[PDB]
């Protein structure tokens, strides 16, 4: 079984365009919703992203 709808890079590179914003703008929807979702900037695949998810983020892409 499989599906034809995929990231056609990896979930890093929607990540990498999550982590250049605003922290202020980051941790603002996090204090209103917990969570961000977002498209992928090259080829527009949805994804999730969490505080804890983030916070890992912040400690592999610096
Ligand atoms: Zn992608």
């Not at 980051?26 to 498209?39: C, F, P, Q, W």
Request: one cysteine or more.
């Amino acid at each position: 079984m499989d599906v034809e709808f995929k990231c056609t890079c990896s979930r890093e590179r929607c990540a990498d365009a999550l982590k250049t914003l605003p922290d202020e703008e980051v941790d603002s929807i996090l204090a209103e919703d917990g969570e961000i979702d977002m498209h992928c900037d090259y080829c527009g695949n949805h994804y999730l992203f969490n505080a804890m998810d983030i916070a890992e983020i912040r400690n592999n892409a610096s």
